[PDB]
Every structure is written in C-alpha cells, then in structure tokens.
Amino acid sequence: EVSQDLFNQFNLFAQYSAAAYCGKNNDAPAGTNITCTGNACPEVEKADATFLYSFEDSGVGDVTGFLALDNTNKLIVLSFRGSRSIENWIGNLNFDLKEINDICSGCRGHDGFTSSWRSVADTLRQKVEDAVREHPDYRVVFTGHALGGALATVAGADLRGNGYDIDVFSYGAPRVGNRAFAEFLTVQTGGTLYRITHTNDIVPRLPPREFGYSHSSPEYWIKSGTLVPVTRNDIVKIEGIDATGGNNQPNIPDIPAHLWYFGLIGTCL
C-alpha cells in the first residue's frame, strides 16, 4: 500500500515515460502540446503540457526522448525512451562496469548507460537549467521506462546539487551500477528516486548481481498482474539494498510483465 498521492504521481510519470516511445514526441517543435496515440498518456494530454525540447538519436546509444513543460502540474519533465532501435540494444550489451568516480567515489556504472548519458549531458543540462530559470517554481522530474529509467537515474545522480531538486521515477529499470553506486543512490539528497518494478518483469533482474550490479533502496513493487489496472493497494514499498521481497525473487521471469506499468508502455509507435 502506498498513499494516493504517490499512486497518482507514479501513474502520471509512467505516462510521461510511455509518451517517450511515440515517434512524434521525439522531433516535435517547441511549444506544441504533448499528446500520445492510443491510451498511452491521457493524464499528460490533460495539460497544458508542451515540448521544451524533443530529441532522437542523440549522442551515443541513440538517446531519445523529450523535455516537457507541464503548466498544470508545474513540472519540467525529462523523459528518456527505453529500448527500440538496434543501436539501443548494442548499448545495452556494453555491460562492463566503468568507473564514474566523477559522480561518486568508488562508484561504477553500466558502460553503455553512462556513456550514453555522458554524450548528451552538457546539452540536456543546459536545457533543463534554462527551463528552471524561466520557471523557478516548477518541479524537475526525470523519468523513463527500462533503459530510459536507467538513463534518468544516471542523469539524476549527475545533475543533483545544482540549486534545484530532481526527483527520478524509473519503471522497470535494470540495475545501473555496483554496490557503491547503489548505496549512493539510496542516500543521495536533493531529490528522491522512485524505482518502480512490476511482478516478475525480467529487466530489473539484469544485469545479475553476479556481474557486480546492485539495486538501490527502496523499491516500489507493483503486485497486480499484466493487463490488470493498478490500485494503490497493489504497490508495496520494499526496503534494503538488493532486497528480495519484490521483483528480485528466485522465480521464473516474464517479458510481457515488462510492458505493463499502470498501462501499456513501450508500445507507442
């Protein structure tokens, strides 16, 4: 059980996350209303939400997504798309642990995720900060599904501490770094990380702990099945680094479970 507030936020950013896959939301002109095709993001279409910056095939690893201005909810949202292109997958396979001592001492991160964020950080950082400067009363949130949630996590770790808080909402994200990085993400201030998983979705179980990867705490585990509407009673908060009460269980994993976080995700064309 989580509160309705958290449930509402989780649902909303799940939808900004889903909206990132829509091709049209990756090269839209600035100032256009953000919409999606289907039933991907009805709460987003509420606004009142417009593109600050759309992007596709940026840097290394085909970085894709958008930066949005949400005037109703008063948000500046950086939404990274998860895996779709061959280039993304090649990057997902760059799974060696590289030092990111520049972010936190003794930390290591997925070579591809970090290289990807690294290749677009200077540009994305300026755009977010330009937005903060124009809308000081807006809240900055980074979000994404899977690979997109990995990116948002690394981006949040890198960009906090610059005068504005950054909350990160990740949906079915893989592990991103070693134990030191898991610890750091657990205690880092200047924003909160909401790492959300769903049933036996295989992605948050990768890469393995036996490759040296670790998950930060806490975890919000959705227990309702695939294609099943989520209620706030279906989300359980699980604590402890690499905790096993949620998605990290020694049972058979599932792929369809990866595509259902509140609603369909990773399916918008």
Report if residue 212 touches ligand OLA, rule: CB under 6 A. Answer: no
Report if residue 146 touches ligand OLA, rule: CB under 6 A. Answer: yes
Place of tokens 């990867």: 213
Report if residue 91 touches ligand OLA, rule: CB under 6 A. Answer: no
Q: Which CB, 87 or 130, lies closer to ligand OLA? A: 87
When CB distances to ligand OLA are compared, the closest residue is 82
Distance of CA 91 to the CA centre of its chain: 17
Q: Which stretch binds ligand OLA (CB under 6 A): 34-42, 157-165, 199-207, 238-246?
A: 199-207
Longest distance between any two alpha carbons in the chain, whole Å: 49
Report if residue 174 touches ligand OLA, rule: CB under 6 A. Answer: yes
Query: Which of 51, 53, 95, 169 forms a contact with ligand OLA (CB under 6 A)?
Result: 95
* DSSP string across the chain: ---HHHHHHHHHHHHHHHHTTSGGGGSPPTTPBP--SSSS-HHHHHS-EEEEEEEEEETTTTEEEEEEEETTTTEEEEEE--S-SHHHHHHHT---EEE-TTTSTT-EEEHHHHHHHHHHHHHHHHHHHHHHHH-TTSEEEEEEETHHHHHHHHHHHHHTTSSS-EEEEEESPPP-B-HHHHHHHHH--SS-EEEEEETTBSGGG-S-GGGT-B--S-EEEE-S-TTPPP-GGGEEEE-STT-SSSS--SS--BSGGGGEESEE-S---
Query: Which of 15, 25, 83, 170 forms a contact with ligand OLA (CB under 6 A)?
Result: 83
Q: Which stretch binds ligand OLA (CB under 6 A): 179-187, 201-209, 219-227, 241-249?
A: 201-209
Query: Which of 30, 90, 206, 269 forms a contact with ligand OLA (CB under 6 A)?
Result: 206
Q: How many residues bind ligand OLA (CB under 6 A)?
A: 14
Report if residue 178 touches ligand OLA, rule: CB under 6 A. Answer: no
Minimum separation from the CB atom of position 266 to ligand OLA (A)? 6
Q: Which CB, 138 or 200, lies closer to ligand OLA? A: 200
Query: Which of 147, 152, 185, 265 forms a contact with ligand OLA (CB under 6 A)?
Result: 147
State the binding string over 40-59 for ligand OLA (x if CB under 6 A, else -): --------------------
Query: Which of 65, 109, 148, 191 forms a contact with ligand OLA (CB under 6 A)?
Result: 148
Place of tokens 């989780």: 10
Residues 147 and 92 sit within 8 Å (Cβ to Cβ): yes
Report if residue 92 touches ligand OLA, rule: CB under 6 A. Answer: yes
Would you tell me which residues interact with ligand OLA (CB under 6 A)?
82-83, 92, 95, 145-148, 174, 202-203, 206-207, 255
